[PDB]
């Protein structure tokens, strides 16, 4: 049972690490999209204020 349990923990933590990395892929893509959106939005606000006056 000890050998089986250790092999199972190896497999389970390997699967958990792979799931976490596969999730970080999507989260990083979303983070970059949102960062660019924030930069664009702030810039548009500034230039729209500048034009309005």
């Amino acid at each position: 049972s000890t050998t089986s349990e250790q092999s199972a923990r190896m497999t389970a933590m390997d699967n958990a690490s792979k799931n976490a990395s596969e999730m970080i892929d999507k989260l990083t893509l979303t983070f970059n999209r949102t960062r660019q959106a924030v930069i664009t939005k702030e810039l548009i606000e500034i230039i729209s204020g500048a034009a309005a006056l």
């Binding site: 893509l29 664009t40 548009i44 729209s48 034009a51």
Partner: protein, 128 residues
């Protein structure tokens, strides 16, 4: 011209994501108020008016036709970006070309899970 003279045509815009960028340049240089991703609010009418001409006239109008195959290019495969959704709501289908199926040597890389054709079974050879 062909469509209205009873013939059949096929037009492949390649890409339509690089026309919307030229239009964004034109607008921003005209000082028009940028919108979402700096695209002008007009960036839809630009593609809708272009792709609404890919019609199929009935026999009382010659019977011609004009198929269209716009090619859009998505950064990091974000199907939910602005222009990709602008065009996904103008067209009659879609062929998603995954970049990981392609890297597996599975070419052409159509992602049959997401690809669809909203005329589909109609206009398909019975044998096929």
């Amino acid at each position: 011209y062909f469509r209205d003279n009873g013939k059949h045509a096929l037009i492949i815009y390649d890409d339509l994501s690089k026309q919307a960028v030229a239009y964004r340049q034109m607008s921003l240089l005209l000082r028009r108020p940028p919108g979402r991703e700096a695209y002008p609010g007009d960036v839809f009418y630009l593609h809708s008016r272009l792709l609404e001409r890919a019609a199929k006239m009935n026999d009382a109008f010659g019977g011609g036709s004009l198929t269209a195959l716009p090619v859009i290019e998505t950064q990091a495969g974000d199907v939910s970006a602005y222009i990709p959704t602008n065009v996904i709501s103008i067209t009659d289908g879609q062929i998603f070309l995954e970049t990981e199926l392609f890297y597996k040597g599975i070419r052409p890389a159509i992602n049959v899970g997401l690809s669809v054709s909203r005329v589909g079974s109609a206009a398909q050879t019975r044998a096929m």
